């Protein structure tokens, strides 16, 4: 039938780095394998080794997913290539990525690259693989193509091998866990939560092996060598503000578009308490950033008005601003100044928020995207925000700052409004779902298995 994949120490260079060292890999035929690790660690390097067959791979049908061109065929077209079934096929797994009838008959050319990205996902889950190859599937989608494509590889018969920083998905998809540590693969059965139970437990025990060691060797000289482990400590706590009175910040009779174009949002109201938990969703392209810019005051509505307490202090979160900060300044620096932080503290915060020690004297302008994240995050710490908002805020954080922004969240006592795909985070945070559509928001009387539900069913999809 299907062969398992079995290469025994094998080593992996790549860009100058020592990517894998006497490696493992162990794919059974069948099983779904998540592959976690920090970033740039070599999880694209590996996926790519293995759809080039670069590393000796037994004849599989194999397909590594990337992004679909551009041109004028028409996105069910390039899915395509009984006939009736088959167009059915592929017209079901557009309409669960987010393509209505439209934009699936329009042509691939009139589509940004996340959409493409989208197509070209479509293509493999239709192509049906013996080992798909997905890297960072959800990364880049919007909630409902996560709720689809999680309920769809549930369904999933053949092997899958997904890179991912997505916890829930992992979570409900994957049977096994591949985890990326010192240039090595190690393996554990059962998925992300199990992994995290066995990983958290191994280091515990590492560190009392390094203890009980280092104690008979002092009993010795008194009367192979194991090294202390590694800690990692992320704390994403947010100050708590201080009481505030109402009005806190709304939009009232709001109409916004831009210029030459059918107006986003027509006579929208929506408020929010000091408490509230917000979770914006809706198809990208629908206005969710905007939205949230408009809640800022950094969009000005066309008629209608924002009005926000003239004390209110808003901490906002969104990749492009990453991009931005103050390039030519260390982390340090800009906290120092932007806030008038001792350097201690400053330290503590860019430590807490995942920034190692030595990228806190790195210019901004050298960091990833993840450090510019995290000193962001840390930024909003110290301004001392009433109202956490986020737009895609998981993008670039490990699954451990996922988590403890979560737990901050649900610490902190100001409000959040939140954009994100991460069903965990939406969920373990309590946040109340608001759907842009009708060029207005709708309120989902109801948790996030009713919002699944609900996708799931306008789709015709039977939730699993
Ligand atoms: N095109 C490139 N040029 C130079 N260096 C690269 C290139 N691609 C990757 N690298 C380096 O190789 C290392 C591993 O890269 P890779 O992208 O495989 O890691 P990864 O973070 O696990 O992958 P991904 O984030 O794409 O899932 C990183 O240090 C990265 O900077
Ligand atoms: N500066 C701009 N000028 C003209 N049109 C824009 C501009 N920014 C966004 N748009 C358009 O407005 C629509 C909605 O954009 P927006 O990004 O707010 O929605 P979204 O995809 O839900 O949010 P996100 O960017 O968080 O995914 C899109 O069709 C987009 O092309």
Redesign the pocket.
């Known amino acids: 039938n299907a062969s398992d994949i079995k290469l025994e120490k094998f080593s992996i260079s790549a860009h100058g780095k020592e990517l894998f060292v006497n490696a493992d890999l162990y794919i059974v035929a069948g099983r779904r394998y998540g592959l976690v690790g920090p970033n740039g660690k070599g999880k694209t390097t590996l996926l790519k080794h293995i759809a080039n067959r670069a590393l000796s791979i037994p004849p599989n049908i194999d397909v590594l997913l990337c992004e679909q061109e551009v041109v004028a065929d028409e996105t069910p077209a390039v899915q395509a290539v009984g006939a009736a079934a088959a167009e059915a096929k592929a017209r079901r797994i557009l309409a669960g990525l987010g393509f209505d009838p439209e934009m699936q008959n329009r042509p691939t050319q009139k589509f940004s690259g996340g959409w493409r990205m989208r197509v070209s996902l479509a293509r493999a889950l239709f192509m049906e693989p013996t080992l798909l190859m997905l890297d960072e599937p959800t990364n880049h989608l ?1 909630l409902n193509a996560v709720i689809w494509l999680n309920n769809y590889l549930q369904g999933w018969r053949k092997t899958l091998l997904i890179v991912s920083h997505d916890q829930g998905f992992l979570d409900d998809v994957c049977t096994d866990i591949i985890h990326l540590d010192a240039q090595r693969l190690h393996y554990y059965r059962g998925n992300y939560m199990t992994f995290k139970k066995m990983y958290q437990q191994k280091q515990k025990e590492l560190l009392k092996q390094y203890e009980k060691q280092e104690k008979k060797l002092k009993e010795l000289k008194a009367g192979e060598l194991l090294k202390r482990p590694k800690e990692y400590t992320v704390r994403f706590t947010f100050p708590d503000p201080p009481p505030l009175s109402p009005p806190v910040l709304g939009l009232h009779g709001v109409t916004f578009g ?2 030459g ?1 059918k107006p ?1 949002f027509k006579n929208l109201d929506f408020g929010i308490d000091m408490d509230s938990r917000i979770c914006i969703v ?1 198809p ?8 949230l810019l408009l809640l800022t005051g950094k969009l000005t509505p066309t008629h209608g008005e924002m009005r926000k307490n003239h004390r209110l202090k808003i901490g906002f979160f969104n990749q492009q601003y990453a991009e931005q900060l103050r390039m030519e300044e260390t982390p340090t620096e800009y906290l120092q100044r932007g806030f008038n932080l001792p350097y201690q503290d400053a330290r503590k915060c860019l430590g807490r928020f995942g920034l190692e020690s030595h990228a806190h004297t790195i210019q901004i302008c050298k960091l990833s995207g993840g450090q510019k994240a995290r000193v962001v995050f840390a930024e909003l710490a110290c301004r001392e925000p009433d109202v956490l908002i986020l ?2 805020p998981t993008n670039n954080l490990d699954i451990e700052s996922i988590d403890a922004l979560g737990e901050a969240i649900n610490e902190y006592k100001g409000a959040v409004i939140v ?1 994100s795909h991460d069903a965990r985070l939406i969920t373990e945070t309590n946040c109340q779902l608001w759907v ?1 559509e009708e060029q207005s928001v709708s309120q989902i009387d109801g948790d996030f298995e009713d919002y699944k539900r609900e996708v799931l069913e306008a789709l015709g999809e039977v939730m699993v």
Request: net charge negative; proline share 0%; aromatic share 6%.
């Open positions: 919007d831009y210029q174009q986003l809706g990208n392209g629908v206005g969710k950033s905007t939205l737009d895609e954009v842009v």
